[PDB]
């Protein structure tokens, strides 16, 4: 069980962020990118892939740019049929501008951007959703547990993360417009000796960089739905 647990002073303090929690909230509200059995259709930079995924409700986007940590990840998934799932942003998002020569590009009307959140479709399917347990702790006490479901054998940490936080925003007011009732918090995934966590709170300051925050998912970290367990540790802001 190692990826050093955070030392209490290591975590971002929500009281140190003085600039609109709504921008964090939106990433984990009901909207998100999801598609099954799609194939990249273009590329803007050598470390990304462009997908033809239409916003199936709000009609907010027609193309989604998936950015990876490096060229390898983009190469691996180029041309392959994948499922996509993840938190997207719009504000600092941009790519291609047109189907121009020299500058390899394409994409017309309504774009969105995201990091990682990709898995091979083929051979990664289960008929019969697997249920992953989430145990949340508030100041040290296991106050509740809820389930998250995925029908993927291999699932990105991004998806389990979004799933978990989406429930907490709805039932625990994890993030609110201008604040959060929690001072610190982190999501811990556990497979085996392998455990890793993400800080759920925004960095100190007056502004939150959605793009920079969502960047932690660019490694396309995957996990096996059969071996994972998730624990959330929240601490209450000095009442
Ligand atoms: O069993 C062969 C049969 O599968 C259908 O697909 C179904 C599948 O039967 C069911 O278990 C699953 O839950 O939903 C699928 C619907 O896509 C196919 O429609 C049929 O063409 C055969 O392929």
Swiss-Prot record:
The keyword Kinase does not apply. GO terms for cellular component: extracellular region. It comes from the Bacteria. It holds the Pfam family Stap_Strp_tox_C. Keywords: Disulfide bond, Enterotoxin, Metal-binding, Secreted, Signal, Superantigen, Toxin, Virulence. It is found in: Secreted. Disulfide bonds join 93-113. Transmembrane segments: none annotated. GO terms for molecular function: metal ion binding; toxin activity. The keyword Metal-binding applies. InterPro entries: Enterotoxin, Staph/Strept_toxin_CS, Staph_tox_OB, SuperAg_toxin_C, Superantigen_bac, Toxin_b-grasp_Staph/Strep, Toxin_bac. Staphylococcal enterotoxin that activates the host immune system by binding as unprocessed molecules to major histocompatibility (MHC) complex class II and T-cell receptor (TCR) molecules. In turn, this ternary complex activates a large number of T-lymphocytes initiating a systemic release of pro-inflammatory cytokines. Also causes the intoxication staphylococcal food poisoning syndrome. Lacks the zinc-binding site found in other members of this family, such as staphylococcal enterotoxin A, C2 and D, thus it possesses only one MHC class II binding site. Interacts with MHC class II molecules composed of alpha/HLA-DRA and beta/HLA-DRB1 chains. Interacts with T-cell receptor beta variable 19/TRBV19. Belongs to the staphylococcal/streptococcal toxin family. This is Enterotoxin type B. It comes from Staphylococcus aureus. The lineage of its organism: Bacteria, Bacillati, Bacillota, Bacilli, Bacillales.
